Amino acid sequence: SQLTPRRPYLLRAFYEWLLDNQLTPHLVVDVTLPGVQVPMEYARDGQIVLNIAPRAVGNLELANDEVRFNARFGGIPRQVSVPLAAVLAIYARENGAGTMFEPEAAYD
């Protein structure tokens, strides 16, 4: 039958590459979806950009089901959880290099 979703492997892929080019990894998420764990106030137009470069995050986790890590908003340490379903894109802050994720049935 149909295989498991690809997004997570490609995500981790681009992640490692943007860092082998010094660039800084930024994640775009859809907050209008279930399972999303972030300070909603920091979002805008049903979205939110998160910095996931090594130095700006703690205990980053790029699992196939979700993205987990700690970070600070305004300085308050806070946990974050993003369903791979709502991970819209990954890109570099410096020169926008990266990729937008293609739709897959696994994520409806």
């Binding site: 930024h26 972030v38 300070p39 920091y42 979002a43 939110i48 950009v49 998160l50 910095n51 130095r55 700006a56 995050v57 703690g58 700690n70 970070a71 600070r72 908003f73 305004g74 300085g75 340490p77 974050v80 802050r93």
Partner: peptide, 8 residues
Amino acid sequence: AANDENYA
């Protein structure tokens, strides 16, 4: 981004 540059 929404979060700060350093989790230091």
